[PDB]
Ligand binder design. Structure first.
Ligand SMILES: CS(=O)(=O)NCCc1ccccc1
Ligand SMILES: [Zn+2]
Ligand SMILES: [Zn+2]
Ligand SMILES: [Zn+2]
Length: 572
C-alpha cells in the first residue's frame, strides 16, 4: 500500500479504488481526482470507508478521521477531521487529463488523442487502463459451441443466447476447450486450429482473455545526443549496397533513439540489416508486434548476416508458423528476432523496432522494460496502418496519435526519411506521394502503364457488418478474361467477406489491406467494396495500392480517391 503518485511521483498510502488499475495518488492529486470524478473510493493500508458497524458510506468526500479510524458525518466522533479538505485527502507524507483517462470507456478517438498528448507517466497509466479495459471487455461476448463438423477446414456453430456474437476475422483469436487457439472466416464457417485437432461436436470456444501486467519503463527513454558514435564500432569496409545509409547509420550511433519513416518499398529491412553490417560487432535485437514483421527482418538477415549469429525467439504458446532457417530460442546469439510479446529480459548495443505504426504505447513501454540498449531505432511509416483499437467506435485515430514514435514523426518529423520507392510503378508512387507524403516520395521505377482505375459503385451487401460487392467482383472477372497476365494477381479489399466471395468466384489468392501491409506482389486487384471511413482511410488506401510491383487494377467506390489515382481509367 506504499507507492509513488502516478502523476507527480510524491509517495503515498492513497490508491484510487475506482480506477480499474488502482493507481497510487498523492494527497494533493487524489483530492483533484475524487472531487471532479464519480471516483470516490480511496484505498490506503485499509479502505477509506466508515468503520461504524452496518454503515456502507465509502465516499471519501463524505468521510472523517475519528482519532485512528474513519467515519461518515452520521457516525464521526466530536473531534473528527474531514478526509477531504484544503485541496488534499488525508494520508501519509502529506490532473484534468488524469481524470479523463481514469473515467473514459475508450470508444472515442479523443480518448486515444489525450493518451498520446499527456505527460509520459499518464501515457503509461492510459496504456495499462486501455489494455485492462480491452481485456475485461472480452468477457462480455457469447460462447461458440460446435453444432456439426463438415470437413477438416469447415464447421457449423451454435452461439450463447443473451450475449453478443463477436466478429469472425483472423484478428479475434479464440481459445478452444485446452485444445489450442482457433480462428474463423464466414451458413458455412471456415475453422483454422493454430493446433490441428479433429474438431468435436459439443466442444466450445471462448476469447483469449490475457492478464495486463503493469508498465514501468517509459514509451520513449529520454533523448540523448552525442558528439561521437557512442558504444558502437563502425567499419571502413561497408558494402556499396549500404553506402547510401552510412550518414544515417552514424546518426543512429550519435543519439540514444532515432526514428526512420520509410514509405512502402524504400528499403526499411535493408536499412535495419545494413545497420548490423555497419556496426558488425554490435549485438542487435530485431523486434516488431507481428510474426510477419519479424519474419521479414529474418528473411533480410538470412541474405546478409551470418546464419550462425542469428536466433528467431518463438514463444512456447506458438500461435502461427514463422521463420525456420535460424536457431530457435537462443537468446544470446549476436542477432535476435522476436515479437514484442515474447522478448526476453536482455541488453543490446542496438534495438531495432520495426513496423512502428502497428505499435501501441503499451508495446513501446514493454520494449524499454525487457531490453536495456545503448541505441533504439524505430522504423516504420505513420502513413501506414495502426494497431486495431477494438474498443474505438467513434472518431478516426489520426497517425500523430498512433503512439509516441508516430506522434514525434508527425510533429517534429522523423530523424531519417527513405525518400525513393524502388517497388512501385511511378503511377502509384505519384498518387501516394501527393496523398500522404507531401510530394517528398520519389519514384525509381517508370510508369508501368499497367495501373488501372474503374469507378464502379456496384451493390453492397453485408455478412453482418463485413461488406461484399458482387458487381465489383464481376467487373474483375470480366477484366481477367481480357487481361490473362493478371491471373497471377493477389486480390485485395478492405473486407474479409469480400475476399471470401472473391476467392470462390476469381480463385485468386486473397488479402485484406491490413494483412497485405509489409508484402509486395507483381499484380494487385483492389476492390474498395464500400464508401465507408474504413475503405476511404487514406492510410489503408496508401497501403492497398503500394503492394504492387508491376500492375494494379482499382475498382473504386469513392470519387475523391478515384480521381486522385494517377492511373489509366477503364470502361464497362
Ligand atoms: C496506475 S498504473 O498501474 O497504470 N501505472 C501507472 C503508469 C506508470 C508506472 C510506472 C511509472 C510511471 C507510470
Ligand atoms: Zn479513479
Ligand atoms: Zn500526485
Ligand atoms: Zn457511517
Amino acid at each position: 500500500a506504499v507507492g509513488a503518485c502516478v502523476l507527480c511521483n510524491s509517495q503515498t498510502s492513497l490508491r484510487c479504488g475506482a480506477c480499474i488499475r488502482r493507481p497510487f495518488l498523492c494527497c494533493k492529486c487524489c483530492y483533484d481526482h475524487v472531487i471532479s470524478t464519480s471516483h470516490k473510493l480511496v484505498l490506503s493500508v485499509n479502505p477509506y470507508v466508515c468503520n461504524a458497524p452496518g454503515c456502507d458510506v465509502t465516499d471519501v468526500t463524505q468521510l472523517y478521521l475519528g482519532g485512528m479510524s474513519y467515519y461518515c458525518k452520521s457516525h464521526k466522533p466530536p473531534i473528527s477531521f474531514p478526509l477531504c479538505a484544503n485541496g488534499q485527502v488525508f494520508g501519509l507524507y502529506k490532473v484534468t487529463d488524469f481524470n479523463a483517462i481514469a473515467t473514459c470507456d475508450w470508444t472515442n478517438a479523443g480518448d486515444y488523442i489525450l493518451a498520446n498528448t499527456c505527460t509520459e507517466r499518464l501515457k503509461l497509466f492510459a496504456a495499462e487502463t486501455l489494455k485492462a479495459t480491452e481485456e475485461t471487455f472480452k468477457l462480455s461476448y457469447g460462447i461458440a459451441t460446435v453444432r456439426e463438423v463438415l470437413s477438416d477446414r469447415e464447421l457449423h456453430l451454435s452461439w450463447e443466447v443473451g450475449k453478443p456474437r463477436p466478429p469472425l476475422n483472423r484478428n479475434y483469436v479464440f481459445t478452444g476447450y485446452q485444445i489450442g487457439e482457433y480462428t474463423f472466416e464466414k451458413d458455412a464457417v471456415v475453422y483454422r486450429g493454430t493446433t490441428t485437432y479433429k474438431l468435436n461436436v459439443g466442444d466450445y470456444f471462448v476469447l483469449t482473455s490475457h492478464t495486463v501486467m503493469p508498465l514501468s519503463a517509459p514509451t520513449l527513454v529520454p533523448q540523448e545526443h552525442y558528439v561521437r558514435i557512442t558504444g558502437l564500432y563502425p567499419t571502413l569496409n561497408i558494402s556499396d549496397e549500404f553506402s547510401s545509409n552510412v550518414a544515417n547509420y552514424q546518426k543512429v550511433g550519435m543519439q540514444k533513439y532515432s526514428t526512420l519513416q520509410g514509405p512502402p518499398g524504400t528499403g526499411k529491412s535493408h536499412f535495419a540489416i545494413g545497420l548490423a553490417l555497419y556496426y558488425p560487432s554490435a549485438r542487435i535485437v530485431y523486434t516488431a508486434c507481428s510474426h510477419a514483421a519479424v519474419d521479414a527482418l529474418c528473411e533480410k538477415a538470412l541474405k546478409y548476416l551470418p546464419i550462425d549469429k542469428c536466433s528467431r525467439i518463438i514463444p512456447a504458446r506458438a500461435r502461427v508458423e514463422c521463420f525456420d532457417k535460424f536457431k530457435v530460442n537462443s537468446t544470446l546469439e549476436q542477432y535476435v528476432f522476436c515479437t514484442v510479446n515474447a522478448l526476453p529480459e536482455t541488453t543490446a548495443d542496438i534495438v531495432v523496432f520495426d513496423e512502428i505504426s502497428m505499435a501501441t504505447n503499451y508495446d513501446l513501454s514493454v520494449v524499454n522494460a525487457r531490453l536495456r540498449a545503448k541505441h533504439y531505432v524505430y522504423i516504420g511509416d505513420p502513413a501506414q496502418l495502426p494497431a486495431p483499437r477494438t474498443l474505438l467506435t467513434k472518431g478516426t485515430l489520426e497517425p500523430e496519435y498512433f503512439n509516441s514514435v508516430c506522434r514525434l514523426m508527425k510533429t517534429i518529423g522523423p530523424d531519417m526519411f527513405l525518400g525513393t520507392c524502388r517497388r512501385c510503378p511511378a503511377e502509384i508512387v505519384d498518387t501516394v506521394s501527393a496523398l500522404v507524403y507531401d510530394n517528398k516520395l520519389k519514384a525509381h521505377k517508370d510508369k508501368s502503364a499497367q495501373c488501372f482505375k474503374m469507378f464502379y459503385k456496384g451493390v453492397i451487401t453485408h455478412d453482418v457488418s463485413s461488406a461484399i460487392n458482387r458487381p465489383q467482383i464481376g467487373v474483375v472477372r470480366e477484366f481477367l478474361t481480357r487481361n490473362p497476365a493478371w491471373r497471377k494477381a493477389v486480390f485485395i479489399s478492405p473486407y474479409n467477406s469480400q475476399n471470401a466471395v472473391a476467392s470462390k468466384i476469381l480463385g485468386l489468392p486473397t488479402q485484406t489491406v491490413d494483412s497485405s501491409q509489409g508484402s509486395e506482389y507483381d499484380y494487385v486487384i483492389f476492390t474498395q467494396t464500400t464508401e465507408t471511413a474504413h475503405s476511404c482511410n487514406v492510410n489503408r488506401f496508401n497501403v492497398a495500392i503500394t503492394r504492387a510491383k508491376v500492375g494494379i487494377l482499382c475498382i473504386m467506390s469513392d470519387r475523391d480517391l478515384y480521381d486522385k489515382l494517377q492511373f489509366t481509367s477503364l470502361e464497362i
